């Protein structure tokens, strides 16, 4: 029976201690109930590990039913609220209660949840898809009899409901045997609501099987948490749909947690301590990170110095209404087997918002944005591509010389103005795609050769070559010595499954992903006294590439490299003004990128 459970839950809600509050033993739910009584809060995430601390039996009979109990709890709190501080007892609820999963249960997959767990508290993991938009869902419909001057209500449970035409008040009927009553959207009560689908990770699927979906009815306070195309973990009851004996089922979410980082959304917990400010304040903080990027890869001391600037990014201006981008694009032309598709796979995992794409397996409308029809409605809708889903992050395109030539000019727009302007036959708009691109490619026919000059063993039209601030050029130079050290590195790796002890142990990925997010928001400036130095450098470049027989196409878009490739450095050193020592680092980079040919 349940009448005695409504007391065994009130006990727990009024008695529970907790020490980690940083103070003494306070009441985790004692403060919560007051806040809820003062209408400063809406949801009450009753954890289940805390009930499983003094009563591991109640937890057994919650995850067994979890549908009655989620109502006993919302009655217990309904009674306790007045004791701290209309007709139906649900129109005046103005709060909701959600179960936060018990720690002993294990997160299933979508394929595992079978019929033997209908009506129980489950936990699934997946990728979001097709999240809807918030719409008001009714809970308590309020009607009025305009004739007899009254008010009536009715509560809703199903996804449908039939209204009333009675005015069942026996007085109004008895006096006159006549009268209709109107619906009304003022006295009623709505609640936010949105439905979203989940799919399995295509990784955890049998070798060639089709992924299965599930439906999630987010509502109340969990709305607007999850974005489409996202890794998420959901906790909620698993029920069948109302209205022969077969049944279609949906997951009724009680708790939604983002697990992008492979552990749990810890982006908001990006707090740097003083013991880490120790490191960040060291003389060569810029040089530790550079060595701690993909440590499994020997050599390439300079490429890792630029792949960090790409992750930090310069600053972006707006004078007299003339936007200048503040991202950096980088290409990695080089011989086969130099670990480029390793560097890219690493820079994919070290970025909050990232995307991975292959040139030969992606079409030009699938990068930017595509207009697609719905055979259920005949209506054309937009669907973002790769560069849209990677808005404030990094996109990675390896096998970049093999992408079809009509599917490659769809990037010229995203690399300069950083919008996507669609004018197909359903839509006319400009999406925002502020992504910074990183691509890899093989030079001419697999291998660089010294007969033909540049620009003919690269094969990029100048209009696209100039979009890249740094077209880095590596080689597979077979220097006997350079090969011996490379081999003695890789064999160590295959022995110990680790890299050989370096001068400074690499920082964890979790920690760098925070060191950088703290290092983005500085916005340094430029000092006037430097405009004479910078200038001369640029001028000198326009001389060399004009008085040479190999050099690439340099243009007035190169100056903004020097400028935006130095506000990155000055952003690492945590300065708030660019100094003459970073301009020379930038200038060295733009020179150490084509020396691999001399």
């Amino acid at each position: 029976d349940y009448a005695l459970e409504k007391e065994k839950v009130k006990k727990f809600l009024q008695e529970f201690y907790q020490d980690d509050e940083l103070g003494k033993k306070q009441f985790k739910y004692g403060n919560q109930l007051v806040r809820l009584a003062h209408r400063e809060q809406v949801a009450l995430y009753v954890d289940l590990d805390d009930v499983a601390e003094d009563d591991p039996e109640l937890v057994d009979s919650i995850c067994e039913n979890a549908r009655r109990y989620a109502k006993l709890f919302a009655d217990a709190v309904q009674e306790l609220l007045p004791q701290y501080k209309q007709y139906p007892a649900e129109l005046m609820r103005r709060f909701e209660l959600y179960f936060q999963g018990p720690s002993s249960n294990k997160p299933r997959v979508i394929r595992e949840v079978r019929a033997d767990s209908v009506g129980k508290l489950v936990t699934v993991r997946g990728i979001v898809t097709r999240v809807s938009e918030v719409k008001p869902k009714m809970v308590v419909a309020t009607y009025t009899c305009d004739q007899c001057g009254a008010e009536t209500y009715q509560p809703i449970q199903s996804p449908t409901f039939m209204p009333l035409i009675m005015c069942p008040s026996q007085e109004c009927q008895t006096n006159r045997s006549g009268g209709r009553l109107y619906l009304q959207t003022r006295g009623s009560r709505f609640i936010k609501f949105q439905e979203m689908k989940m799919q399995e990770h295509s990784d955890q699927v049998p070798v060639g099987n089709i992924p299965r979906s599930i439906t999630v009815l987010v509502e109340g306070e969990n709305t607007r948490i999850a974005q489409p195309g996202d890794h998420v973990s959901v906790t909620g009851i698993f029920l069948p749909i109302l209205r022969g004996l077969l049944s279609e089922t949906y997951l009724e979410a009680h708790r939604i947690v983002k697990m992008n980082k492979s552990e749990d959304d810890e982006s908001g917990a990006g707090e740097l301590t003083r013991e880490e400010l120790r490191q960040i304040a060291e003389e060569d903080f810029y040089e530790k990170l550079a060595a701690s990027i993909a440590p499994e890869i020997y050599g390439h001391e300079d490429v890792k110095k630029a792949l960090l600037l790409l992750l930090v990014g310069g600053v972006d201006q707006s004078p007299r209404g003339m936007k200048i981008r503040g991202n950096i694009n980088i290409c990695l032309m080089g011989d086969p087997g130099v670990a480029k598709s390793q560097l890219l796979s690493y820079i994919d995992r070290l970025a909050p918002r990232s995307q991975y794409t292959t040139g030969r397996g992606s079409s030009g409308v699938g990068l930017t944005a595509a207009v697609l029809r719905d055979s259920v409605s005949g209506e054309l809708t937009l669907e973002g591509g790769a560069l849209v889903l990677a808005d404030q992050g990094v996109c990675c395109i390896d096998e970049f010389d093999k992408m079809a030539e009509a599917d490659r000019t769809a990037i010229h727009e995203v690399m300069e103005q950083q919008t996507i302007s669609i004018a197909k036959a359903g839509i006319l708009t400009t999406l925002n795609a502020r992504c910074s691109i990183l691509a890899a490619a093989n030079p001419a026919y697999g291998r660089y050769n010294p007969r033909r000059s540049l620009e003919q063993n690269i094969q990029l039209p100048a209009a696209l070559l100039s979009r890249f601030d740094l077209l880095w050029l590596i080689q597979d130079r077979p220097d006997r010595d350079n090969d011996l050290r490379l081999a003695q590195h890789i064999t160590y790796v295959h022995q110990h499954s680790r890299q050989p002890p370096s001068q400074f142990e690499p920082l964890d990925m979790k920690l760098m992903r925070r060191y950088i997010a703290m290092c983005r928001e500085k916005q340094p400036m430029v000092p006037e006294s430097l405009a004479d130095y910078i200038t001369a450098a640029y001028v000198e470049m326009r001389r060399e590439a004009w008085a040479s027989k190999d050099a690439t196409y340099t243009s007035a878009r190169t100056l903004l490299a020097i400028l935006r490739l130095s506000t990155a450095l000055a952003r690492l050193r945590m300065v708030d003004v660019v100094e003459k020592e970073d301009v020379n680092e930038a200038i060295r980079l733009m020179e150490m990128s084509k020396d691999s040919l001399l």
Binding site: K137, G393, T409, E416, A423, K424, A425, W546, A556
Partner: protein
């Protein structure tokens, strides 16, 4: 609630003073507005529901919370303060009141169900409209026995049948006569949130607005508005038969006020009646600025104050914003005559072409921006789509027709296969388009003006070949242009230094409303007619062009150029408001046509 508010509103309407300026203290602000309403037609009063926030705070709570039970009071309380001008002018309809807000209030993603049925302001970009839809107000019934015609009103929002003939009493004989009742109008419009003010890596939404009786056709697709109106939500039924309505409602917006303040653009051609609405203090300014010996070079040099010198291209792009006269050739049976100027920009990379297009497209209203490979033959002019609902082929408009008054920037002009390039031959010379497809045989027309940008073949201007070989365009397409700007720019050690010195400056840190109004004026009240002294310099200016362009092999001259000179000459006269074409207005627009290909 009703009487208590008109008394509090009349006070506001009478005693209000602001620390502001209008139409370039006259205490009776809204009484002056109400006087203007009397001296002319247009019985609408645009009240700012923030002024009512200074004067009061207990109606500003009841206007944005019960707007449909207040705005009738705000009409009545204005009708009575119209007592001053009651006897003078007696219009018929009624006086109106329209609250609004200078600045937006919400987005399209943060509309929550605590905001149902209360004043709300958003902003977007109208996508598409619909045709009018009637909507009943007063029914009109009639009996089949007594043939007596009662006229019941719709009060609450539904129509009730009487069921008793006031004469014969047959207890149901009152049919509804449709075309004797009273209807009003209703239009359905779709917004689309702007690219600014949307989250990271997401796709635009839409929102449905419903216009009403008088706002029914006050907006066009392609406009940026600040709609203000109530926010409602109405149920839907799962069957069009049963009364089983769903539980997830569906929302729209009953618009109340538009606002198209596009100060980031110039003046669209809906404001030609509004040109007579210029302060006579301003026409003095314009006529006096138009007298300085160089107002040409003083306005031109104020276009895009971020490009470096490029002195001639800004001249051309300034004359393009005026265009030749609009002569009326219907009598001579010739047809019509193009009056807008098409400009082509060819030149080696890095020379800042795409920046000029990106600047113009953001200046002119009613424009588009297209690219090379991401635009097809039919997407630019007109396609035929299988309409989803009615399953019938219907016509639509491309990009060169949606502009129609403005500029159609076509970047990457070279990289369009010769099929989709031969389509511009019609729309850019005759200002027409003749379509003959499955069921559609029609003839559109437009007043667009291309502004194209291309690269030389080989993307490098090699001076070994002839000018008609670096461009590699045919002659039947090069002649439809009339200003082919060859940005021949090498590595001039002085130019590069000056440009770099200019560009760096953008990192430290004439008006518009002069130009933005000078242009509207010079469009509204100017029509340069040729002379006999000007016409006698136009004949030789074409007899020499032939001998010149014949030999060199650069670009031949066909009689069409002799019309372009006209187009250019007249367009120069409009700059200085000269209303008559004289000699110098031909020498200028001849030197411009000659000193662009060198």
């Amino acid at each position: 609630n009703v009487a208590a508010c008109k008394e509090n509103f009349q006070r506001f309407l009478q005693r209000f003073i602001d620390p502001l300026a209008k139409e370039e203290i006259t205490e009776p602000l809204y009484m002056q507005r109400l006087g203007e309403i009397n001296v002319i037609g247009e019985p609408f009063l645009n009240v700012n529901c923030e002024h009512i926030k200074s004067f009061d705070k207990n109606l500003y709570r009841q206007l944005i919370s019960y707007p449909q039970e207040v705005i009738p009071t705000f009409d009545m309380a204005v009708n009575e303060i119209f007592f001053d001008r009651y006897p003078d002018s007696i219009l018929e309809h009624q006086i109106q009141v329209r609250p609004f807000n200078a600045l937006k209030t919400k987005n399209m993603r943060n509309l929550n169900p605590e905001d149902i049925d209360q004043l709300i302001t958003i902003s977007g970009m109208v996508i598409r409209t619909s045709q009018l839809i009637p909507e009943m107000q007063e029914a009109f019934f009639q009996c089949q026995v007594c043939a007596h015609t009662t006229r019941v009103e719709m009060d609450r929002g539904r129509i009730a049948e009487p069921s008793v003939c006031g004469r014969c009493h047959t207890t149901h004989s009152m049919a509804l006569i449709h075309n004797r009742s009273l209807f009003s109008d209703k239009q359905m419009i779709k917004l689309q949130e702007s690219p600014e003010d949307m989250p990271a890596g997401q796709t635009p939404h839409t929102v449905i607005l419903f216009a009403h009786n008088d706002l029914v056709d006050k907006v066009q697709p392609g406009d940026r508005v600040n709609v203000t109106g109530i926010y409602r939500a109405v149920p839907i039924r799962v069957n069009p038969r049963v009364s089983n309505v769903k539980s997830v409602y569906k929302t729209h917006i009953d618009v109340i006020h538009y606002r198209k303040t596009d100060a980031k653009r110039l003046h669209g051609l809906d404001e030609e009646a509004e040109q007579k609405l210029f302060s006579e203090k301003r026409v003095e300014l314009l006529k006096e600025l138009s007298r300085k010996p160089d107002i040409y070079e003083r306005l031109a040099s104020a276009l895009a104050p971020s490009i470096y010198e490029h002195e001639d291209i800004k001249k051309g792009i300034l004359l393009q914003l005026f265009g030749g006269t609009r002569k009326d050739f219907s009598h001579t049976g010739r047809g019509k005559f193009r009056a807008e100027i098409n400009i082509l920009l060819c030149g080696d990379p890095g020379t800042s072409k795409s920046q000029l297009l990106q600047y113009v497209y953001n200046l002119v209203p009613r424009g588009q921006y297209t690219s090379g490979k991401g635009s097809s033959a039919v997407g630019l002019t007109a396609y035929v789509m299988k309409d989803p609902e009615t399953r019938q082929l219907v016509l639509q408009t491309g990009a060169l027709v949606l502009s129609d008054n403005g500029i159609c920037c076509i970047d990457e002009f070279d990289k369009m296969n010769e099929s989709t390039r031969s389509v511009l031959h019609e729309v850019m010379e005759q200002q027409t388009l003749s379509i003959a497809k499955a069921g559609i045989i029609c003839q559109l027309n437009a007043r667009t003006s291309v502004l194209a940008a291309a690269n030389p073949i080989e993307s490098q201007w090699n001076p070994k070949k002839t000018t008609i070989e670096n461009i590699q365009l045919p002659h039947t397409l090069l002649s439809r242009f009339d200003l082919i700007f060859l940005l021949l720019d090498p590595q001039d050690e002085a130019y590069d230094r000056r440009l770099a010195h200019h560009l760096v400056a953008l990192y430290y840190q004439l008006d518009m409303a002069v130009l933005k109004d000078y242009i509207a004026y010079a469009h509204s009240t100017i029509m340069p007619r040729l002379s006999e002294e000007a016409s006698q310099a136009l004949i030789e200016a074409y007899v020499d062009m032939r001998k010149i362009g014949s030999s060199r092999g650069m670009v031949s001259a066909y009689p069409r150029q002799l019309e372009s000179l006209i187009r250019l000459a007249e367009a120069h006269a409009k700059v200085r408001l000269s209303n008559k074409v004289e000699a110098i207005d031909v020498e200028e627009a001849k030197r411009l046509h000659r000193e662009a290909l060198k």
